[PDB]
Nucleic acid binder design. Structure first.
Lengths: 130, 51, 170, 213, 178, 156
RNA sequence: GCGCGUGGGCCCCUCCUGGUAAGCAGGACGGGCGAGGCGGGACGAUCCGGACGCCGGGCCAGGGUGCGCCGCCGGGGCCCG
């Protein structure tokens, strides 16, 4: 329920890299694509251009994949799976899968409380019965 | 159209390759009389490889 | 700028088993420039290149500055026209200081850098011997002139953020 | 087994350092005393005592890696200066002196004072061990590599490099080319002779290097 | 930026591990590497490399060649990184101790009929990881026809056969032809 | 360059010297050349037959073969990136012996011979490493007879 | 060993041929752009510096320091830029 202490999580870039000329056209979706033009201001990386994706922006290995709570995430879609995930696991937390129905989530939460594995989405889909 | 600029940089990229050890000591172009006599001298006592 | 006297000789050879020592009075910014100039002069005047020669010493000379003495410099400037000759006359406390004043006028008046000018001779001239009017005017015992640049005292207006209540008098 | 060798070796190196710190200290004093005395004696005899021409130089690269002609690149590589504001110790031989004239535009050099040698080795000095750059923090790691050269301590190192001694080549190669802070540089395109910064600076390389070390 | 393109001569690439899906070859390589990491014996480093090589660089050595090579020393244990193969020409076969990666069944039968054990690299690690009394042997690497076709057939100093049928006279009959 | 004959651009190199025209001295023919010896190939214009090409002039090489009228010399020629041995047959007149290795032979003789001479006398081995010039020593020089020097004015 | 692109190049030096001469037409050592971000040169693919992971300090090249627009003063000489 409480994560091990760990080290400060530093994110090198706060805002997502966006593809060149994403703002100008709806057809160009924000998904990053490498600058490929012969005379692309982006490929050259001229002053005032959007930043380019580089391995340098990599998060510290120990903090990589870790969620803000301090635990990491391993998804669970059933109760058997949750007992396997928590077995010998004080470094991870379980997000109930979106597919899991409201009826089944009650079983997962009740087992999780016994297991001691934190559930990130414990309040999801809670509306009494049918 | 003709121009040889960048030829020397291209040649020196990993060049200045020496000829090879077999080339320096070879039986090619040598005096045929020298070659015949050399084989007879070799074909006797320790150097002989004949069975 | 610093008054060095350098002693240098041709490298010992089988023809010259004792080569001739040559001394020069090179006024230079630093010992490295002084020894470069010494070799340049020796090459033209005595045919000795640094590659065939050895400088034996380059001693710094310190001169006292107790009183102002007139000094005369004969030099051979080079302008785009070609090499010429020029005599200068500077009243200064020390020879190196006078030579610094000499190089600055030749920079402003004749547009020649340190390496363009070659100093044939420097000397101390007497109050009687002055040959140029500017040195002669101050050489006389009594010299009273109003402050030449009273206005220069605005060096304070720089810091006063320039907001004086009244406009200053000189 | 290993514990004994480390306790025994450490004491031997520490003794070498305290014992020879005083020994070299006097030798450096001896050099100033010999030159000062002879200068005065020669003046008494009416002759001028010349001092010996430098056996070692401190060469610092002051220009960059773009636009270097191929000869100039090779000569720099052998001098181990491959980067701007990098400095190496180079012996003075006709071979070294005639090569450095070729590369004068990219370097500034001069005889190094023993305080410059000590402050370069101690603070910015590192070791090439198995082609790695290992920081020199103790006289002990110096001992393992230069053990055949009898140089067993950092002060022993400064003496060999200052004097271009018998164990100089091995010791200069043992020192990873010093990476120094940005050069002051009044002019990069003209020689110190012209008042710029390229080429020989003589004693003034101890002043130029002071800010960079 | 640093000039690292003067005296540095680029990075060569070599086979650090076998690319063979066979887990037994991969296991033996790890074992002979682990032994050589501990005891730096040349024989163990060389075996590790020869296990790693490809089929083209691992040519077969027949019982006939092994007989000639070990003629001087019966005691010494031969080691071949490639498979051993039978020689039907060698009617009589000596007594040999051979550690091969694989033995042709006919060769295995003949060597053991002559009283000599057919060892395997698993057996070699167990008995002699050091390689005391062991010789490493290799097949002629240039035995493949592919190795005799390499080159330009057609230049005067070729000594390389044309690649294909040909059946014409230009160049085929002398330098003066063409 | 619109013509490339064997003797193009050879007007000055293949020409004889100021006062060397005539026939080659008989020493050249008497001279003995042994296998592997270093020879230097300089083309002689008078003896046209068995002449080397202009490239192989000034080049120094080793005698691959010793034959009747002509010897065979291998010199290394740079073509593009590679340097490839060219085995050439040259008439005796064109080839002369080389003193390129003579220095090493002198040093090698002294290297062993001085070491033996000192071996009988002083025990420390003589240093046999050529040092490249080196710097200067203490060196005292007299100043007493020094000459003052001053630059002279541009007379014109 | 096995392939791929490329086989229209152009500039800055320096020596050139040639034309009266060019941001002209052909040659060559090197470097540069091509395919090299960044700072400066007001502006300029090539000039002067610097040749690039992501960053936080410090140093400082080249170029500058009235105000735009970051950053300067001191001294000597000159003066209808």
């Amino acid at each position: 329920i409480h994560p091990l202490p760990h080290k400060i999580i530093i994110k090198k870039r706060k805002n997502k890299f966006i593809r060149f000329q994403s703002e100008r056209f709806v057809r160009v979706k924000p998904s990053w694509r490498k600058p490929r033009g012969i005379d692309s201001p982006m490929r050259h990386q001229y002053r005032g251009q959007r930043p380019m994706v580089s391995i340098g922006y990599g998060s510290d290995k120990e903090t990589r994949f870790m969620l803000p709570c301090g635990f990491f995430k391993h998804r669970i879609s059933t109760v058997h799976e949750l007992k396997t995930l928590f077995m010998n696991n004080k470094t991870h937390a379980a997000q109930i899968a979106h597919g899991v129905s409201a009826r089944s989530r009650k079983q997962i939460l009740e087992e999780a409380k016994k297991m001691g594995v934190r559930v990130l989405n414990a309040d999801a889909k809670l509306r009494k019965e049918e | 159209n003709h121009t040889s600029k960048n030829q020397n940089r291209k040649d020196h990229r990993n060049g200045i390759k020496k000829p090879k050890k077999s080339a320096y000591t070879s039986h090619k172009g040598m005096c045929p009389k020298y070659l015949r006599n050399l084989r007879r001298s070799r074909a006797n006592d320790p150097r002989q490889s004949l069975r | 700028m610093q008054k060095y006297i350098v002693y240098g000789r041709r490298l010992p050879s089988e023809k010259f088993p004792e080569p001739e020592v040559f001394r020069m009075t090179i006024y230079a910014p630093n010992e490295i420039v002084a020894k470069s100039r010494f070799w340049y002069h020796l090459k033209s005047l005595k045919k000795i290149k640094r590659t065939h020669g050895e400088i034996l010493d380059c001693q710094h000379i310190e001169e006292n500055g107790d009183f102002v003495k007139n000094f005369g410099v004969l030099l051979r400037y080079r302008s785009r026209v070609g090499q010429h000759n020029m005599y200068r006359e500077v009243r200064e406390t020390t020879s190196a200081r006078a030579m610094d004043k000499v190089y600055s006028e030749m920079a402003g008046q004749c547009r020649a850098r340190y390496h363009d000018i070659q100093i044939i001779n420097v000397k101390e001239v007497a109050d009687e011997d002055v040959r140029r009017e500017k040195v002669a005017m101050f050489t006389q015992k009594g010299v009273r002139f109003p402050h030449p640049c009273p206005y220069v005292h605005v060096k304070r207006a720089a810091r006063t953020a320039r907001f004086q209540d009244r406009a200053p008098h000189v | 087994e290993r514990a004994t060798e480390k306790e025994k070796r450490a004491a031997l190196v520490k003794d070498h350092a305290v014992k020879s710190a005083q020994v070299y200290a006097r030798y450096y004093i001896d050099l100033v005393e010999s030159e000062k005395k002879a200068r005065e004696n020669a003046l008494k005899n009416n002759q001028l005592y010349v001092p010996d021409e430098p056996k070692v130089y401190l060469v610092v690269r002051i220009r960059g890696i773009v636009g270097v002609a191929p000869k100039v690149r090779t000569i720099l590589s052998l001098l181990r200066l491959r980067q701007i504001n990098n400095a190496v110790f180079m012996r003075c031989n006709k071979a070294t002196l005639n090569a450095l004239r070729i590369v004068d535009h990219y370097v500034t050099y001069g005889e190094p004072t023993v305080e410059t040698i000590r402050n370069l080795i101690y603070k910015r000095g590192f070791a090439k061990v198995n082609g790695q750059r290992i920081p020199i923090v103790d006289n002990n790691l110096i001992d393992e590599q230069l053990s055949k050269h009898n140089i067993l301590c950092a002060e022993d190192l400064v003496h060999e490099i200052f004097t271009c001694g018998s164990s100089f080549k091995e010791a200069n190669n043992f020192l990873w080319p010093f990476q120094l802070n940005s050069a002051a540089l009044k002019d990069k395109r003209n020689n110190f002779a012209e008042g710029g910064d390229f080429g020989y600076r003589g004693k003034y390389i101890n002043e130029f290097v002071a800010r960079m070390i | 930026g640093i000039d690292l393109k003067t005296g540095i001569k680029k990075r060569k690439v070599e086979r650090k591990e076998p690319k063979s899906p066979n887990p037994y070859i991969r296991l033996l390589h790890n074992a002979f590497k682990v032994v050589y990491e501990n005891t730096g014996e040349d024989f163990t480093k060389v075996l590790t490399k020869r296990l790693c090589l490809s089929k083209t660089n691992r040519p077969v050595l027949s019982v006939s060649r092994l007989a000639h090579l070990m003629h001087k020393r019966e005691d010494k244990i031969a080691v071949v990184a490639s498979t051993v193969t039978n020689d039907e020409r060698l009617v009589t076969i000596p007594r040999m101790t051979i550690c091969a990666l694989k033995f042709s069944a006919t060769a295995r039968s003949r060597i053991e009929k002559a009283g000599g054990r057919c060892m395997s690299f698993d057996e070699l690690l167990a008995e002699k990881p050091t390689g005391d009394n062991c010789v490493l042997l290799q097949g002629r690497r240039s035995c493949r026809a592919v190795c005799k076709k390499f080159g330009s057939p057609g230049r005067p100093n070729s000594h390389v056969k044309p690649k294909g049928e040909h059946k014409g006279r230009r160049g085929a009959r002398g330098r003066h032809s063409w | 360059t619109h013509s490339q004959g064997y003797r193009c651009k050879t007007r000055y190199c293949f020409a004889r010297k100021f006062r060397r025209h005539g026939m080659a001295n008989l020493t050249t023919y008497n001279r003995v050349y042994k296998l592997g010896q270093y020879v230097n190939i300089k083309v002689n214009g008078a003896y046209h037959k068995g002449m080397p090409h202009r490239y192989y002039n000034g080049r120094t090489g080793t005698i691959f073969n010793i034959g009747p009228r002509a010897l065979g010399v291998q010199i290394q020629k740079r073509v593009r990136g590679r340097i490839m041995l060219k085995r050439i047959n040259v008439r005796l007149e064109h080839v002369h012996p080389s003193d390129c290795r003579k220095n090493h032979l002198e040093r090698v003789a002294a290297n062993d011979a001085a070491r033996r001479l000192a071996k009988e006398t002083g025990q420390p081995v003589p240093c046999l490493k050529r040092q490249n010039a080196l710097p200067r020593a203490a060196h005292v020089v007299s100043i007493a007879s020094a000459i003052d020097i001053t630059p002279l004015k541009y007379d014109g």
